Design a binder for this molecule. Structure first.
Ligand code: HEM
Ligand code: HEM
Ligand code: CYN
Ligand code: CYN
Ligand code: MG
Ligand code: MG
Lengths: 299, 298
């Protein structure tokens, strides 16, 4: 019934994402997941000012085993989109921790690793940070059309009824920005690529921007109803090394996310997102975040 | 006028960049002036960040930029303990610290834009203050660090001569093995450090082993402490490499070297007990000139 604490929080400045494969028997994830959510409650009690939230989510094969094939009807392994333009790196477990304090997130990440122990093989650990003026590292404001407030975010992200009530589908994809390539583009060119102006963050009218602009690729409607998602993405990386956006989105329907990916990567109309001129996705996975009561009923 | 990153206390986050000079040493002259101007711009834009930064130079490049004048104690970081403390001496150190990691990141990008392809970045470490100002080992870090601008200036900043306003910097990245630490009982970890873990109380010098960290580094010469200004912070990922990025400033390189000779077995043949769970993997000495000296880089 109860949603996991990390799906809905807004404005968190820091996050940690851990993606891992299952090394042993899948049944090891049952007690580890219960221990971890108990650990999250302990850290929320110890650091109330952190406004800590976390999510434990599962890949298709593992979730089919843990659920006995019941529910999560849209869950599947992340496919390769655009025949390869969006790679697929589907793992078994996703742990997303977000709060106002990176140091508290770090302790929670250590608790997650202690709980799962050697049952998992960590493939990725990314430390996200909100950058100046809530900008992506490209220099464009991120966040503007993201669903706002608990009520609307719950409507978009949280499954309303049935066996999966309180759960959500998660999509994660790490992008590597080439800022030298971006800086070769004039600001008019970068704005036509995104579909919003850079300094003032004003939307460029849909009839004035290219159909390849990011907003034209992802602001999708079906008979006038927007295919909304709750984004929790953040910048990550080092200034001298790899950096970019760690894309993360929650939705009550995996469909909304998939339609945006088919659009961005050329599968819908043969055109692809103009942001591929300076950044590329290097990982990709779909996961199912059960409700807290469902995690308690894993035993 | 001292560089802004030496003296600030209680920084929440830092970025350290260590690099080698690829191009001409003269490219570091203009780049350093641009960078200190960028730091002043970021301090004006983000006053709440309490942003500071330091540009410091390795022995060979500082001898060229200074014409061999001053910085009498500067030298390439040697290995200590015949190898226990490795040496990775580079040409340039950029240290950025503040209350806001996001501001540090913009300043790091400005540093890389200023130096451009004249440098080869060897290391970039993003430090974060952990819960209760503890090191990742779980011990509080900073208790006996000089407190207040007056005392920190006395310890870190050169008082007179050509180098007035400058400071010597030492950086050393440590990689913690928390599995090895967790195999130790809390009393055994407490005798290794020389302070109690939860309460952070000093264990009397006559009660703790001479190998305890405090016994290795709380050194006195005729009753006067060999003080240093530490700016170290935890770093890393929970699943990968993590530890302490050690950073210290001192008006005399001597104080730092005496602590290293002690920790790594060169003084009395005994080594720091912390080597049971953590090890240093980089090491370098740099000279941080005063701001007036950076302006005069001609
Ligand atoms: C390099 C990676 C990406 C960057 C830099 C990026 C950047 C942005 C920016 C600057 C905006 C406009 C401000 C806003 O409304 O939040 C935006 C909007 C959006 N992005 Fe992305 N994005 C990225 C990847 C993605 C991906 C992979 C998806 C979905 C699969 C996505 C879905 C959205 C949605 C739904 C919107 C809101 C569009 C609207 O309704 O106006 N983005 N993105
Ligand atoms: C793994 C690396 C290290 C760890 C985990 C570590 C940890 C600590 C801790 C827990 C304290 C006690 C609290 C305090 O006064 O701050 C301390 C004190 C100190 N450390 Fe370290 N330290 C490390 C490396 C070093 C190094 C390389 C040096 C110098 C070369 C150093 C010099 C000091 C000094 C001067 C003190 C204050 C001692 C006193 O006057 O009581 N530390 N360190
Ligand atoms: C889009 N973020
Ligand atoms: C010691 N830090
Ligand atoms: Mg719209
Ligand atoms: Mg003492």
């Amino acid at each position: 019934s109860q949603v996991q604490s990390g799906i809905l929080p807004e404005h968190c400045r820091a996050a940690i994402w851990i993606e891992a494969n299952l090394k042993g028997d899948v049944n090891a994830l049952r007690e580890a997941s219960k221990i971890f959510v108990d650990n999250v409650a302990t850290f929320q009690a110890k650091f109330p000012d952190a406004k800590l939230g976390a999510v434990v989510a599962f890949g298709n094969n593992v979730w089919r085993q843990l659920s006995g094939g019941e529910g999560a009807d849209e869950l599947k392994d992340f496919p390769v989109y655009g025949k390869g333009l969006a790679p697929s790196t589907q793992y078994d477990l996703l742990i997303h921790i977000l709060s106002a304090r990176h140091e508290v997130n770090f302790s929670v990440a250590q608790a997650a690793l202690a709980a799962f122990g050697d049952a998992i093989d960590v493939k990725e650990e990314i430390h996200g940070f909100r950058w100046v003026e809530e900008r992506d590292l490209s220099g464009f404001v991120d966040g503007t059309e993201n669903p706002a407030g608990e009520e609307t975010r719950r409507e978009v992200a949280v499954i309303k009824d049935g066996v999966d009530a309180g759960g959500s589908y998660v999509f994660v994809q790490r992008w590597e920005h080439n800022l030298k390539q971006l800086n070769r583009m004039s600001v008019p060119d970068q704005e036509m690529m995104i579909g919003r102006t850079k300094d003032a963050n004003e939307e460029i009218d849909g009839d004035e921007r290219p159909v390849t602009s990011h907003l034209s690729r992802v602001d999708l409607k079906e008979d006038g109803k927007g295919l909304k998602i709750v984004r929790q993405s953040l910048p990550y990386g080092t200034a001298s090394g790899t950096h970019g956006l760690y894309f993360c989105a929650y939705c009550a329907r995996l469909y909304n996310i998939e339609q945006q990916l088919l659009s961005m990567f050329g599968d819908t109309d043969g055109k692809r997102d103009a942001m591929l001129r300076f950044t590329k996705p290097v990982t990709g996975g779909y996961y199912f975040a059960p409700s807290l009561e469902r995690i308690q009923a894993l035993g």
